[PDB]
Paper text:
The γ-tubulin ring complex (γ-TuRC) acts as a structural template for microtubule formation at centrosomes, associating with two main compartments: the pericentriolar material and the centriole lumen. The γ-TuRC has a helical shape consisting of 14 spokes, each containing a copy of γ-tubulin presented by the C-terminal gamma ring protein 2 (GRIP2) domain of one of five paralogous γ-tubulin complex proteins (GCPs). The GCP proteins interact via their N-terminal GRIP1 domains in a specific order: the γ-TuRC core harbors four pairs of GCP2/GCP3 (spoke 1–8), followed by a sequence of vertebrate-specific paralogs GCP4/GCP5/GCP4/GCP6 (spoke 9-12) and finally another pair of GCP2/GCP3 (spoke 13-14). The inside of the γ-TuRC is lined by a lumenal bridge composed of one actin molecule, as well as two α-helical modules formed by the microprotein MZT1 (mitotic-spindle organizing protein 1) and the N-terminal extensions of GCP3 and GCP6 (N-GCP3 and N-GCP6), respectively.
We subjected the purified X. laevis γ-TuRCs to cryo-EM SPA and identified a subset of particles with stoichiometric NEDD1/N-GCP3/MZT1 grapnel density. We, therefore, subjected the NEDD1/N-GCP3/MZT1 density segment to focused refinement (see “Methods”), improving local resolution for NEDD1 to 4-5 Å. The very C-terminal NEDD1 helix segments were an exception, as they were predicted straight, but are kinked in the cryo-EM reconstruction. After optimizing the model by another round of MDFF into the density obtained by focused refinement, resolved bulky hydrophobic side chains and the length of resolved alpha-helices confirmed the density segment as NEDD1. Our cryo-EM reconstruction resolves a tetramer of the NEDD1 C-terminus, comprising two consecutive helices in each protomer (NEDD1598-648 and NEDD1651-670; all residue numbers refer to X. laevis proteins). At its center, NEDD1598-648 forms a tetrameric coiled-coil that provides the binding site for four N-GCP3/MZT1 modules. The interaction between NEDD1 and the N-GCP3/MZT1 modules is characterized by complementary charged and hydrophobic patches. In addition to direct interaction with NEDD1, the N-GCP3/MZT1 modules also share an extensive interaction surface with each other, suggesting cooperative binding of N-GCP3/MZT1 modules to NEDD1. In contrast to NEDD1598-648, the NEDD1651-670 helix breaks the fourfold symmetry and forms two small dimeric coiled-coils that splay out from each other. One protomer in the upper dimer of NEDD1651-670 contacts GCP6223-240, which is part of a larger region of N-GCP6 that lines the inside of GRIP1 domains of spoke 1 and 2. The lower dimer of NEDD1651-670 appears to make little to no contact to spoke 1 and 2, but its conformation is likely stabilized by an unidentified wedge density between the upper and lower NEDD1651-670 dimers.
Author numbering:
A (entry chain q): 10 to 65
B (entry chain J): 207 to 329
C (entry chain U): 597 to 671
D (entry chain Q), E (entry chain S): 9 to 117
F (entry chain s): 8 to 66
G (entry chain r): 7 to 65
H (entry chain R): 6 to 103
I (entry chain W): 621 to 671
């Protein structure tokens, strides 16, 4: 279910010219199903992408 | 460091605030302003202490020299090129603020004419 | 339609100015957050230096040590 | 819940397990501090918003395409909070005509 | 960047070559925090806000002048950081209006 | 050196009109930091605290 | 001088009363003295509301 | 005298309804608040502030009292002891009540 | 709305900081306490090996 | 007031204590922070805002029913301040 | 207590319409807090956060 969804989401990200990984979206389905506010989910990941940039 | 060298060999800036400031002399009648301010601040219940540009005693006569023939002055406000007047924050320590205003207002109105007469000059 | 867009153009101008006032406040908010935490550390930092250990005492252990070595270099 | 967050941190950044530390302390704290939801269970406003985004990026074609893939998600019946992933994508949208700040060794500044 | 920000602190205060350490420490903290600026890149959008600001202090002649200066600026050098400088100046603008209070007694409270 | 100086001079023209009220030297530092990547919002904030700190000190 | 300050106070005092205030004449005098001495109007307004609130919890 | 420090203590003492040394704990708290910066919503034009006070009067259903306020304003302008009228006017506007 | 968040934050910081300062002092031990620990340590050593 | 705050805290987490000392202390902290109401004794508007929210959630049938419930309280004339409790219900709407 | 409960039933119903779980016991306690002239804004901040804490945990 998680994989099937990840491919369609992967299509959308590519359109926006926004890079996310395969893995991120799949973890996202796990967090949603446990309950996560939409603001929170976005905020952790946005920061995590910037951290990765600075780090290398 | 070069910045510090300039700051000692040139007199301390008074068009921008980023240079420390004198208004001391050992005579008893030359610290008159600090005495005058103190008086106003205790007598008058409603005194408004201005934010004063500390000048740099008897260098006001160098700005009278330039002003009377020479260039527009961007150290003092001129509302237009036919109206020269003197900013309300200039203090010299050995006079009052008001007392000071009054000598600088005579030369301002005499530099109003030479500056106006200079706008007639067509090169 | 013309008048519909007329109203539309007037409201964007007014909303933009409003964004700037709100933005300036948000930026003022940030100056205060970060600056307060910086103060807190300075206060905590000194208090912690004084009572967690005495620099004074430790210098004195080292001194006594030195006095005793020097005593033994005089026999 | 924690295990999930750790896996997000470690994986993207690579294995320091002490140099991915920052994100992890950051992560637990941010989600645990409760707020009441905004842009939730109003998917109609969100679809419209992403279409405007496309219109702005000078890709009119991608907006009709997106709408087709969107309806494909509904039939699957999986992924409880659709809106949250859509909300995420939009935040990180960028136009094909600039690129946002990339610098490293930012601690020095 | 350590040198550049320290020199930034020393210059503005007009003095203190290792006494501005405390202010410096703060500045390193603020910069180390992150922002999301409303309007990110794109030269047209920042020029438009600057003109509105010019009109508002009643400096029309200046708004017209600046626009030539912007085209000139570009021609002299081209960056991807052009916008960040123009937005920086924008935020850092000063109004001519009012006295900026006393500092000669405001220090004491 | 030629290219750099000529953007700054155009840059100082704007700064004096727009009423930045900063010095020449300080602006060059602001620009170097940008080209190396800085956020603009943070940078104005720091400038502001430093500026206020200087005035109070002198009086 | 004594007369003039009284009239200055007097007018402000009339305005404070129309707008309804809980400050007395003495406190109001103090505020003006603060105004003249600098102090942006928002900081003053805030410190007052917090102090007014704390007094009610105590009494 | 009338240094800021001495004036802020007197204000606190009367408003809290407690002694001079017994308002200290709030006195320190008061200094942090004033020394943290804010900026008014209205920053430019003396007139922008006055019209606001005038709008407020109407809102409270006290049209007559706003007329009286205009008259007082002229009085304040003519005596000229104060050079930051606006601070005083914004401050009462904020502390307005029914 | 903004003002309210600003003024509360600063009240929380002052209160917490003061309470923190007292507390820190408690477990780390004040200068009175260090000197008196040494007095008792001198006494005890003296009965066990200078008597 | 103090004990009425302590009771409330125990009841929301589930009856009987089980290390809820911290949660009571946390609420004491919140109540010592001064917040400021947007409207005060304007109970009628607070009912009107609830209804606008119910159209906003697309739960209009709930919005008709709520009107009857407030009108009930209005008839009974209980003193506590009706505005105080309604303002609580608006935040949770 | 009989009068407090009667009111408490009315608030319990309102609480169903917005779709929030609250115990009956907590709804009675809120009544005491506003009669004492407690600030409704602090009150709501307590209700929101502790009920939410309880649901996320379980």
């Amino acid at each position: 279910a998680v994989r099937e969804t990840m491919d369609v989401l992967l299509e959308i990200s590519r359109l926006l010219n926004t890079g996310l990984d395969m893995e991120t979206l799949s973890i996202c389905v796990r967090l949603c199903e446990q309950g996560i506010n939409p603001e929170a989910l976005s905020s952790v990941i946005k920061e995590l992408r910037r951290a990765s940039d600075t780090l290398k | 460091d070069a910045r510090s060298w300039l700051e000692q060999h040139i007199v301390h800036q008074y068009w921008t605030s980023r240079a420390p400031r004198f208004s001391h002399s050992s005579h008893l009648h030359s610290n008159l302003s600090a005495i005058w301010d103190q008086h106003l601040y205790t007598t008058d219940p409603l005194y408004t202490p201005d934010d004063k540009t500390i000048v740099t005693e008897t260098q006001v006569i160098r700005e009278t020299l330039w002003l009377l023939s020479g260039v527009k002055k961007l150290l003092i406000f001129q509302l237009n090129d036919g109206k020269v007047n003197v900013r309300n924050d200039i203090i010299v320590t050995h006079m009052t603020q008001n007392c000071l205003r009054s000598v600088l207002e005579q030369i301002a109105a005499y530099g109003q004419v030479v500056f106006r007469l200079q706008k007639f000059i067509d090169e | 339609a013309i008048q519909i867009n007329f109203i539309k153009n007037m409201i964007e101008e007014t909303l933009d100015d409003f964004r700037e006032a709100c933005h300036r406040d948000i930026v003022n908010l940030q100056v205060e957050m970060i600056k307060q935490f910086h103060i807190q550390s300075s206060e905590i930092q000194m208090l912690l230096e004084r009572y967690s250990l005495n620099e004074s005492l430790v210098s004195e252990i080292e001194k006594l040590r030195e006095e005793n070595k020097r005593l033994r270099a005089n026999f | 819940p924690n295990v999930l967050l750790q896996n997000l941190c470690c994986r993207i950044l690579g294995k320091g397990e002490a140099d991915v530390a920052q994100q992890f302390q950051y992560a637990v704290r941010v989600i645990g501090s409760n707020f009441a939801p905004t842009v939730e269970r109003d998917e109609f406003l969100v679809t419209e918003k992403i279409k405007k985004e496309f219109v702005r990026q000078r890709r009119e074609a991608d907006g009709a395409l997106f709408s087709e893939l969107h309806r494909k998600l509904q039939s699957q019946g999986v992924l409880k909070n659709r809106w949250s992933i859509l909300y995420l994508l939009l935040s990180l949208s960028e136009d094909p005509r600039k690129q946002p700040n990339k610098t490293s060794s930012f601690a020095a500044l």
